[PDB]
Symmetry: C4
């Protein structure tokens, strides 16, 4: 009877922990936030670059389109008629910033055959090929290289390369007329030319109705082959924490969560000190360790982020400067990811107390007894899966977007297995190998290989049911 | 022999009942009705707001677009050249009505940090923060709050909030010139401003060729974050019933259905009294009780709806007023839902007489024998399903429309399992966690977990067949 | 040895027959024909109604759009600059024809409540409500009713109704200027009004390069609820057969096919005369009877169609008339359908000689021994399938296009099972019952019920393999 | 121990070989190449033909659109302001070339019935119907036929026909003004008329930043039924190889790969000389032979291609000519295809050393024992699959794009099985047979026939596990 009562006590404690965690994670969420970013992104990406034009920021194709956007839709969205409100609600915080990364002329070598017709070549962006010399009129921060440290920047993982936080930057103005003049001055002096490899536009807004910031980042990359590759980022933040009663309730819930985390840390360490050799012999102990580690990491990230609020205080002293909220947004994204993973893994631990009756124990035994063969056939299946992915990358890699990178081929093959196919592009890219690849993949994966998993599961379930009937 | 004859008599009676119910439910449906609403919705939602503009009602983005629609496409669709026929057949009944819901300034608290730059804040719509004071010129019903009781209104479940039936309303006119003047007067005095949270446009039409009304409701919501969220509703009604011979035939069928339902009620009550100890132990008795309860609820709703025809009589006395058919449309929708569910559950009861031979009995035994294990593994499977849904909500909640609400995540995961995927948006929202979530979900759900249902069914079928073979 | 050699002889004869049939059916096909209709349909449907307008023929919405098409894109497509070639290759044969079907005023009864505001009502199209009296100026065939017999017409199965071959028709002219004048005269006198229920535009072209006709039919329906429902039909024909060497080769193949069919008829009749009582005890005999009946029907249709070449001869005598090729196109479509079905069923008969070794016999025994239970569970599964379809029709019937008709619901549910879903529209139509219907359908159909077929097949295969190992 | 250590040595050697091959195949790929072709194709295809027009090169519909493209978007893309750079990076090499294929008047025979109205007919393109006589002004190479040998051309496999390398060609100029004059002169003299059957536009560019050429080919076909069928081809080439350090590293890797291939060839020949009769009894020996043959073919193609760099040398002597890189592009495509297949098959051989423990051996034995029955049921299943495909071709062949060719039907049926359906077009093409075909195909294939594969696999797995358990 002691075992059942102890299990019930553990179940009740874990249920309380689960309710606390769910309350926290839904308190840090709301429907108000999705439409915030939806309207912001629509305004800044979906609006045509100009009345006559049709291309938006989403469909930029050249430097001329980027200049039209910068002098056009961007200024329309940013400034609303001394203080701007991106809508009638969202105040524009301070000043926007524009930054570019540059590459040296001669960072690549032209073949000796063509040196008579081609004199200048610019390599793809890299830390080695980066340009750090003044150009243009050399008047101000837009024409002089500023290091990452002096710019208080950080690296950004772009579509085709990873970019540093340094470059040539200009701080725009509070009003539309001044910003337009600055942008026109930049364009006249040819700010963007052959050496440009990336450009960033950063600005943040604040919504007092719901007490949420929004950090915006627009990146346009200029590959060595010509054209542009636009991208965007809209990240809401809650820098100010305690403004309402629900905020204090969530603070209390967070304190309770920290108490629970410390209690679990102590409990797990106590058992580790005795069973350390065989502690990882059970999956539940590994799950408990993962949960506690993730929760501790989340707590540490939260503590670090809460002390970074001093950047907001610096901005509030003088509002004519650029508010650097990129680090806060990055750490908020990291915290959200870690909290989501912790919640997911806390949910999975519910299987520990799910053996109510003989049926649940039957199913759990079937699933545990089936893992050894499932892993082996997973290796076997994924060998062929990766062979097919490599063939697809080598065949359609340069033509089809779905196969443009070795990682994207895996996702495309998963989608094809599910039923989300784009066979027209595959057939267009290669009229002989495209159809052969598609047909053979579909056959040997959907029709045959996918059924080995189910055969293993079926045999294991039947064996377990026959055995446990005793 | 008595058992077989009694079962045959029951089967014949139930076949007659099913035929009557199907006749009723298909008589209350026609192909003419779908194209009615199709043309109405194409006229009002799909037409461009103006000749130069591209945005329609479906794609409104701001208060300016809403004003352009109200002064533009709405008047074009409403008035066709004293009486308006909306294509050439649908008489416009009475006048339309426009109603807005409002919020008080100061219903939220600004953080003390930003009180020097922001003075006014309006909270999200709620009954507590609702505004009930006059504004603007204070001339008429458009500038004074009218309660739900005095407005004969009712609540509406919107996209982002549930709204009351009160607010500030104006009754438009019969002709285009008067309505345009009223709308221009509203716009000049700034009817919509920071405090607006919702707006409604209501009107109904009548088609004499097919004898059907159409109650229309256009709702535009104004979130606290800016922008607009349009929505619509086109609900045909049949207030006048006995016109043609088929209508009298359907009335006779309804009388027969009522007699059948009374007979079944008496039979079920007698069986409950006789076999109180075994009634709820059988699934068929539960199905019979569900069917009888749903049919009684449908009959009650129908009786209430017929007594509600008095609203049409009030309108017919004076045609210069607004016909309030919202309640009739709501109850028609409820009746349709109840009747559809009753039909569905009446169809399922055919399984009672489906045991013709050994094959059908074996199949039914197999289905009823694995229900115990199917429910347990359904619990086990849906624990992981909801864990994945919660992770998806916490990760893509603020970026992807498909995961914008906790309920939307479940439907999106069902669609992903089927094969309807939107992986591009998932990868765009999170380039690391998006692919991991998608790949792990697909693997652990489609490839492995979904096959446990199949293993259970296969093992149970084999066991049942082996047992019943002897 | 006797059985093996007789089977070998039968297999050789049937392989020759199959080769002949495949040769015929692929000789009556060519890639040249798909692009013929593709260009015709792109020219007539896809092109905008006018330079300023955006609506196509596919997106007509009112009588004004239809008039603009008739005076606009239609004349541009028809006439190319006495003889017109709809492209630089396809001669326009004779003149086009326009025909409308009409309904009487007062074919429905207005409710007594509204008789003071509505005086005229036109019912949906039917043979009883059809109008047969002159209207308008009463000058010519466009304003007088012409019966189906005198018009040499036939019924057409439209989208919302089935239409007769009678009505009010006008024969257009050979040149653009005359046709435009006729259409303008029709429009000025108000040819289309409240009574119109359908309109037809018929014309045919000839392409001498590939020796193919193309019979075109554009139908626009005018429901009693307003609006228009466009539809089209492009049917290539081969009236002139024996021109090239391949045509004579195909004639020889057709003669060989008739000889084979007579031989098979004689064989089957001889077998029936001996085993008439138990002849239908075998599936292969039923397949043979089906094949022979379908082939005889195809031969009869071909003989009827060849005699119907006299219509072309009548047209060729005077080219200033309307070539009535509608019957030839209808019979060509019927012949193509019957030939396709015959080819499909001839392919299936290849299973008779597929028992090469023990593996094929094992699989055939498994499939035949499984049909008894597969049919029973098919009935069981389709009862629930039809219950769900009826619920979907009653719930989303008036809002969603995919559920607009009772037959559309079945196809939509099949598509949903496969993975082709449109959940957004379902959720929009009903925000409570939509999600419930979708989720419950997906669960109980894909997760559970679809696996009973698979369990039955697996058990039968295992039993057959265990038995035949003896 | 004797077997295990030899297997370990073989595994290590094959792992080294696999790493070398993967290094080579990923060194011949880069993300920079996908966006190269992406920008090129967006510039030339997606760009509107003119400011007023909407048709692209992808949506050409007639000779007028082709002329507008040639005088419009093509010249805008080609020439950027003596030397042109398609972007600010990609130099235009030499001059473009325009070529056309032609057919004789009278290559077909008109029926005697219509010879009084039609005088000229042009057959579909073929080597027999090809025209080879001068036309037009007869001034220069654009109006005289040049054979394939004298044009240094080669055949091209188009959408509706295979085309020779001969025809009437004009070499365009280096500057926009001269090319526009030449194109206008061609258009004025009616270069394209009834006899035209195909047109090609060829040009290549070079990117010094990434050292990659791009051979471009735009083909517009003119069917005998009218209209145009555009198509395109963008193929990057690495003609110049030894420039950077990574290039020398890849050369060393290629030398190592050649040594490995020679060693494997010797090893396999040694075993063949001994096991001549039973060498093919093992699947692994067949895989080794396939790998060796494919690698040798790839090496031969590479040797042929490297010695073919002389074409670039000829062009570099005089840059005022047309650079004929078509053969180099063709052979690069062939080499890429063969290398991809070799990589795929090299990956599959990893299964030989995958028998680590009892689980992997059991899975491999299950897969091996299945092949006998799986092949038989594959024949059985594909008989019905091809019957359905033939029926679909005969029914929807002339109406639906997905069924336009007998090969397209197979791919469309695979897609339908997966879940990628276009049921709307199928139902539109045939309203009776379309739904029947779709429903019966889905049922008999997805619900029933696809489960026999799984039944076989499951039964074999259970048998193998029971046998090997003891
Ligand atoms: Ca699927």
């Amino acid at each position: 009877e002691k075992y059942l009562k102890s299990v019930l006590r553990e179940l009740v404690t874990y249920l309380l922990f689960l309710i606390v965690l769910c309350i926290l994670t839904y308190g840090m969420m709301s429907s108000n936030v999705y439409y915030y970013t939806r309207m912001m992104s629509q305004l800044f990406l979906d609006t045509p670059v100009s009345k006559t034009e049709k291309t938006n920021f989403k469909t930029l194709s050249s430097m001329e389109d980027f200049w039209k956007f910068t002098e056009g839709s961007l200024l329309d969205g940013l400034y609303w008629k001394n203080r701007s409100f991106i809508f009638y609600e969202n105040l524009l915080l301070g000043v926007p910033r524009i930054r570019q990364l540059r590459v040296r002329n001669g960072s690549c070598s032209i073949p000796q055959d063509l040196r008579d017709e081609i004199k200048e070549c610019y390599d793809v962006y890299s830390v080695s090929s980066e340009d750090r010399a003044p150009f243009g009129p050399r008047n101000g921060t837009a024409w002089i290289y500023t290091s990452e440290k002096d710019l208080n920047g950080s690296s950004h993982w772009g579509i085709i390369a990873t970019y540093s936080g340094a470059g040539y930057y200009l701080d725009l103005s509070r009003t539309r007329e001044e910003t337009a003049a600055q942008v026109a001055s930049l364009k006249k002096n040819v700010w963007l030319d052959r050496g440009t490899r990336a450009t960033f536009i950063d600005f943040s807004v604040y919504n007092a109705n719901i007490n949420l910031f929004c950090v915006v980042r627009l990146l346009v990359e200029f590959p060595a082959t010509g054209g542009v590759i636009p991208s965007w980022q809209f990240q809401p933040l809650k820098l100010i924490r305690y403004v309402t009663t629900f905020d204090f309730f969530l603070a209390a819930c967070e304190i309770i969560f920290c108490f629970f985390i410390f209690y679990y840390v102590v409990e797990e360490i106590l058992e580790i000190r005795i069973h350390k050799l065989h502690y990882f012999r059970s999956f539940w102990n590994c799950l408990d360790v993962v949960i506690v580690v993730l929760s501790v990491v989340a707590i540490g990230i939260n503590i670090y982020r809460t002390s970074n609020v001093e950047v907001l205080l610096q901005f509030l002293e003088d509002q004519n400067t650029f508010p650097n909220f990129e680090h806060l947004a990055y750490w908020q994204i990291q915290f959200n990811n870690i909290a989501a993973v912790t919640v997911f893994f806390v949910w999975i631990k519910l299987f520990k107390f799910i053996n109510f009756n003989r049926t649940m124990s039957q199913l759990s035994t079937t699933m545990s007894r089936c893992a050894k063969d499932l892993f082996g056939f997973a290796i076997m299946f994924f060998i062929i899966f990766l062979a097919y992915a490599q063939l697809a990358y080598l065949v359609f890699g340069t033509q089809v977007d779905d196969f443009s990178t070795s990682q994207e081929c895996i996702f495309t093959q998963f989608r094809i297995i599910l039923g989300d196919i784009n066979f027209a592009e595959i057939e267009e890219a290669n009229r002989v190998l495209g159809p052969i690849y598609f047909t053979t993949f579909v056959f040997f994966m959907f029709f045959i290989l996918l059924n080995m998993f189910l055969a293993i599961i079926n045999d294991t379930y039947s064996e377990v049911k026959s055995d446990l009937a005793q």
